[PDB]
């Protein structure tokens, strides 16, 4: 199981900017990713859903691919 934080179990269209910041922290800790700069994802869930894989990589060269794949996993249900 991915041990998603309780507040992040809402559909991501409803995530706030604070939720997205918590999502980044969860991804980094749960999957032992390299450090992600929270300041490069100052957006809400609707904003996050508009990003392409490349948008993720430009904000996080080291972990952007993983973040996009984790969001895809959540979306696939």
Curated annotation (Swiss-Prot):
The record marks 9-10 as: Breakpoint for translocation to form PAX5-ETV6. It is found in: Nucleus. The record marks 8-9 as: Breakpoint for translocation to form ETV6-MDS2 in MDS. Ubiquitous. Disulfide bonds: none annotated. Residues 1-77 form the PNT domain. Belongs to the ETS family. It is linked to A chromosomal aberration involving ETV6 is found in a form of chronic myelomonocytic leukemia (CMML). Translocation t(5;12)(q33;p13) with PDGFRB. It is characterized by abnormal clonal myeloid proliferation and by progression to acute myelogenous leukemia (AML). Chromosomal aberrations involving ETV6 are found in acute myeloid leukemia (AML). Translocation t(12;22)(p13;q11) with MN1. Translocation t(4;12)(q12;p13) with CHIC2. Transcriptional repressor; binds to the DNA sequence 5'-CCGGAAGT-3'. Plays a role in hematopoiesis and malignant transformation. Can form homodimers or heterodimers with TEL2 or FLI1. Interacts with L3MBTL1 and HDAC9. This is Transcription factor ETV6. The gene is ETV6. The chain holds residues 47 to 123 of 452 of the full protein.
